[PDB]
Amino acid sequence: MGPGFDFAQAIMKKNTVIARTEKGEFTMLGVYDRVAVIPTHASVGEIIYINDVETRVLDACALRDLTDTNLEITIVKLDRNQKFRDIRHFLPRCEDDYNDAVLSVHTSKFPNMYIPVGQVTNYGFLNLGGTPTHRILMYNFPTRAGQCGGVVTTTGKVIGIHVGGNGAQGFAAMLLHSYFTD
Amino acid sequence: GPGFDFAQAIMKKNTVIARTEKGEFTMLGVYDRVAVIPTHASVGEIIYINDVETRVLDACALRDLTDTNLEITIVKLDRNQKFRDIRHFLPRCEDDYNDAVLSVHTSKFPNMYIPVGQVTNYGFLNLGGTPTHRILMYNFPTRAGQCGGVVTTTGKVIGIHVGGNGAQGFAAMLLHSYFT
Known part of the structure; x- marks a missing residue:
């Protein structure tokens, strides 16, 4: 508007892509290459659904600050055939x-x-x-x-x-x- | 929900895209060839509907029985499709x-x-x-x-x-x- x-x-x-874990469907922001973010409570595992396509997770890292406090951001690298x-x-x-x-x-x-x-x-x-x-x-x-x-x-x-x-x-x-x- | x-x-x-002299507005079609648009869109004799030049047969800038503006304009469009x-x-x-x-x-x-x-x-x-x-x-x-x-x-x-x-x-x- x-x-x-x-x-x-x-x-x-x-x-953006639609990400599905065992804990639901989430909006997922792609940032660069095959790297995206999602809330840590999504509980990303070894496999995730991306726009209803079964996708291997190459790496996932739940971020914490240097006081070792939760930031609630997980950075995921997807085994996807296309970059953001x-x-x-x-x-x-x-x-x-x-x-x-x-x-x-x-x-x-x-x-x-x-x-x-x-x-x-x-x-x-x-x-x-x-x-x-x-x-x-x-x-x-x-x-x-x-x-x-x-x-x-x-x-x-x-x-x-x-x-x-x-x-x-x-x-x-x-x-x-x-x-x-x- | x-x-x-x-x-x-x-x-x-x-819902269709209406373009007046002032630019583009979201337009609601209600029934037949009758639609509504804000009065501030300044509807003329001709309007574009989804990029198609369309004659406006009638335009009514609505007012209530106190004779006060309601800011809705009802339009009747010369087009084949019916809403x-x-x-x-x-x-x-x-x-x-x-x-x-x-x-x-x-x-x-x-x-x-x-x-x-x-x-x-x-x-x-x-x-x-x-x-x-x-x-x-x-x-x-x-x-x-x-x-x-x-x-x-x-x-x-x-x-x-x-x-x-x-x-x-x-x-x-x-x-x-x-x-x-």
């Missing part, structure tokens, strides 16, 4: 707050979904489903089941992936450029 | 709603679905300096363009997006009596 949605759409149309457009230049280098973000989801249940979530706070620490978690972004929108893995963008920046909510607020794990140095 | 199925079913058969009749999904009365979806369809934003959630019967709004009635309101914390879109709940087509103030978004109510 506006330039925020434009950037979100451009990310969705080229840099390299979007690493759209990742922020530092922890930050943002104005006017969009949360975008694409699953069987929620195809082509885009939500203007407004201001995003650098929230920091969250007890997420009982697990201490760092580098959380917060937005005041009542997100729901089915949105985990959804991409949070501003114009020109891909800043996080949706990992949870409390009914009134939604929460995303930060994406930082430094996670995807090769 | 089934809200998303409903929004897609309305989009697929009843699937959806008048039975239009509310009879003014109401509040939960769990609404706004569905956008332009050349730039094809098939885009925006869950807006809770929708209030807001009522009176000074829209661009024009007093307007029968406005629905939802959170919309962005500055959107003009193109608008169709607002649905499960089982109902309730309004078309007509504007916003950067925090809130506003739709004009669709009522069954407008098309009787």
Whole structure:
């Protein structure tokens, strides 16, 4: 509807796949080459479904900060026959707050979904489903089941992936450029 | 929920891309060759529908019996295709709603679905300096363009997006009596 949605759409149309694990269907952001991200609670194993195709997982790494605290991001390398457009230049280098973000989801249940979530706070620490978690972004929108893995963008920046909510607020794990140095 | 199925079913058969002098708008076809578009689209004698030059036979800028703007223009189009009749999904009365979806369809934003959630019967709004009635309101914390879109709940087509103030978004109510 506006330039925020434009950037979100451009990310969705080229840099997402539908990932299925034993714990459900997730929006999954491809970052570069055969490397994607997904919430750690998806419990990625040795095999994953990518757009309903059985795919071997070459590597998966649940990220933690240097205090050994959960970040809720898993980086997956897929045995896929095609690379993603390299979007690493759209990742922020530092922890930050943002104005006017969009949360975008694409699953069987929620195809082509885009939500203007407004201001995003650098929230920091969250007890997420009982697990201490760092580098959380917060937005005041009542997100729901089915949105985990959804991409949070501003114009020109891909800043996080949706990992949870409390009914009134939604929460995303930060994406930082430094996670995807090769 | 089934809200998303409903929004897609309305989009697929009843939503077309309309282009006026002002650019592109999501247009809802209601029945026969009758459709609606925001009044601010400035519909002329000719309009493009899915990139086809189309004569507009009639255009009515709706006002209520207080003689107040409603910001809906009803158009009758000179085209062969007939819209699937959806008048039975239009509310009879003014109401509040939960769990609404706004569905956008332009050349730039094809098939885009925006869950807006809770929708209030807001009522009176000074829209661009024009007093307007029968406005629905939802959170919309962005500055959107003009193109608008169709607002649905499960089982109902309730309004078309007509504007916003950067925090809130506003739709004009669709009522069954407008098309009787």
